[PDB]
Symmetry: C3
């Protein structure tokens, strides 16, 4: 399946596909997330189940997002953009928006992992569960007094640290590894074409590496990769 | 003692008490500190022994804070607010304010750990000593060209990344773990009431965890188990 | 050799020399770099082989920097200052500027490690190679759309988080460890004088550590043991 193929790729491989096939200059990268609870295996990949948090004074009612987390999803939480910043810590609240009971439930429902564009708490609990969680940072405090979830399966706008606000839609493919988080925009991407290119790119990259290990200069090795991938 | 009871709580549990018993919206959290030298147990707790630093040209004389660190303290160092920032690295100097010899002495004096709202140096020495140290970051250089300690057991004002300045008073309880640092204001707190609440809240959440692992939805479990907390 | 002598020192020991011998208030520290691919040994040292990156629209041609990395170098990459920031993430691009293939070639050439004033990609590849790399952060994306290398062995200017811009020249000595990165500016300092001082200072600080473990107050011990350093 789509997911299965993507699970074999690093986030770097996926960005090479997005950059070179779709001319996306950032390669679909969402920067400055840390794997607080790392995946056991190489990467996590899944379809985005998005959740939007707003100030508690917002007129929209609080929603229960966690109890409907889909199997094989990546659960993706974000704040209203006014509470985001272009500089670390990247959000303007000190409270966490997601803790260990949330990971417990998401794991029960067979989610592949969580990306929080904000803070998590109960660091050791996520790790003990072995539930993968990426976040900007950590907190000790529940969100009660400041924010609440107001939307699920909505578009998420993320103010990134290059000044550009990038978006994540429901059903987008999310991949995370030690290089961070990438998103494949499913509306706009022919997954077969992308996967085919990425597979070839991995083959060619491996040969650049082996060229170098065998004493061939990088310039020559990179030139030959370019020549191959051109076609 | 209450310190012994607090030692068994995570910082999240303590924040649950401060938020719910005292309506402290941030739950006493001081954000963005890293456990550069981590606790040997889960958490550290102690009474705040505060130390304020200022520019070297300030007329307040330099003080020797390290040699009077009390037993069972948490040693807490901060700069004046004008040297702090709401954005990482959270302070405007690159020099460290605290090194390996400092931990050696603080530990000798039986301090429970250090929190530096600034940079520390000699990372490997703190770690070899197993002396817990939380800080904003690290440096390589001593502070003497730029800042000095000018006060002990004074109020510390910490400009935090939500824009709000929070305070730490001498004798406040400070707790630290992998979630960061929380402070309990002791002048404004009935510690017994707070400890009792936190106990009950911990109990509730263990029960919720069990429920969720048994296939009960989180909302249902939380609403069922947490009802009892209102009367504490 | 100089590098062999420096290899025995922590970055803190080196900053002690730069601060005390040369009155360099920051001790040559370049702040906020993380050891994303940590050294196997305690520290890395080498002579700086510098690489400057600029926007792709810059009139200078892209260059091949990696195939000429010298043995025993530290490869140092930086952006033009206008692409830098005083706050994290310290650069204004999300793309990586250095990946796994570059460490592969640098390692082949016997470079001692890399410092990137920017983001690196292929985290696991550097680690698998056991090639030391310090950087501001990570990325997943190649730099093709945004920046290119435009010079080698040119001056680098680093806007640091205290607001001061500090420079790195080819042939400067670079040291890195868990405290971060320090640079010895060889055209402003005498290496033999610095090495001699540092060696003495390390001995002094050992004695202070042992004094503190004997119950001697730290500042007293410092003043006593460090008196010998005054003549230098």
């Amino acid at each position: 399946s789509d997911l299965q193929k993507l699970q074999r790729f690093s986030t770097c491989d996926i960005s090479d596909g997005l950059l070179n096939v779709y001319n996306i200059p950032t390669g679909g990268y969402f920067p400055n997330l840390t794997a607080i609870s790392p995946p056991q295996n190489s990467s996590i990949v899944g379809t985005a189940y998005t959740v939007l948090f707003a100030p508690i004074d917002d007129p929209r009612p609080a929603v229960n997002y966690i109890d409907s987390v889909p199997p094989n999803s990546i659960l993706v939480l974000a704040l209203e953009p006014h509470l985001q910043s272009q500089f670390h810590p990247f959000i303007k609240i000190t409270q966490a928006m997601y803790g260990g009971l949330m990971s417990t439930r998401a794991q029960y429902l067979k989610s592949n992992g969580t990306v929080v564009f904000g803070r998590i708490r109960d660091v050791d609990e996520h790790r003990t569960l072995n539930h993968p969680v990426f976040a900007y940072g950590v907190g000790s405090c529940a969100p009660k007094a400041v924010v609440k979830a107001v939307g699920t399966n909505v578009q998420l706008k993320i103010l990134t640290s290059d000044g550009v606000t990038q978006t994540i839609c429901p059903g987008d493919y999310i991949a995370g590894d030690n290089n961070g988080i990438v998103r494949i925009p499913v509306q706009e991407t022919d997954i077969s074409k992308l996967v085919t290119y990425i597979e070839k790119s991995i083959e060619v990259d491996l040969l650049v590496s082996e060229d170098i290990k065998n004493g061939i200069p990088a310039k020559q090795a990179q030139n030959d990769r370019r020549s191959v991938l051109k076609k």
